């Protein structure tokens, strides 16, 4: 409808595929090479789908701070036939509050959904489903099921990945450009 829906439709449309897990179906991000990243919930193994296709999961690693607490974070590499385009340069280096962001949602029950979710606060400490979480951004908007993994965006900026929600609020884990250097 607008600037910031351009930029999160650009994204969806070239960077995201579906992922199942044993825990469910998620939208998930690749970032780029066959990096990608999903909520650490989903509990990725040795197999995951990509699309409905079975893909052998290269290495898998649940990103902690170095004070050894949660990030709800987990990144991918997927022994997949073809490249993500390079998105690490729309990644914020900082922790930061932002406006009018975006939540993208793409899976077989949400398809082509876009939710403007408005301002998102530097939350920072969240129990999420009773495991200390860190690096948390908070949206005013009631986020349910089916959206974990979704892509939060402002124009020019993927800032994370939406991993909760307390009915009133939607919770997402922050993507840093530091998390994806090679």
């Known amino acids: ?18 992922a199942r897990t044993e825990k469910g179906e998620f939208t998930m991000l690749g970032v780029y090479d066959r990096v990608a990243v999903i909520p650490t919930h989903a509990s990725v193994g040795e197999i ?8 052998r999961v290269l290495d898998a690693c649940a990103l902690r ?18 490249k993500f ?14 406006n009018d962001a975006v939540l993208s949602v793409h899976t077989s029950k949400f398809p082509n959904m876009y939710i403007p979710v408005g301002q998102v606060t530097n939350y920072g400490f969240l129990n999420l489903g009773g495991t200390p979480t860190h690096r948390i951004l908070m949206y005013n908007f009631p986020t349910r099921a089916g959206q974990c993994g979704g892509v939060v965006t402002t124009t020019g900026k993927v800032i994370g990945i939406h991993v909760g929600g307390n009915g009133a609020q939607g919770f997402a884990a922050m993507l840093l450009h530091s998390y994806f250097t090679d």
């Open 1 to 18: 409808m607008g600037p910031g829906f351009d930029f999160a439709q650009a994204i969806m449309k070239k960077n995201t595929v579906i």
């Open 65 to 82: 701070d170095l004070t050894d607490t949660n990030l709800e974070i987990t990144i991918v590499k997927l022994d997949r036939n073809q």
């Open 48 to 55: 995951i789908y990509i699309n409905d296709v079975e893909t």
């Open 85 to 98: 385009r390079d998105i690490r340069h729309f990644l914020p280096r900082c922790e930061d509050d932002y």
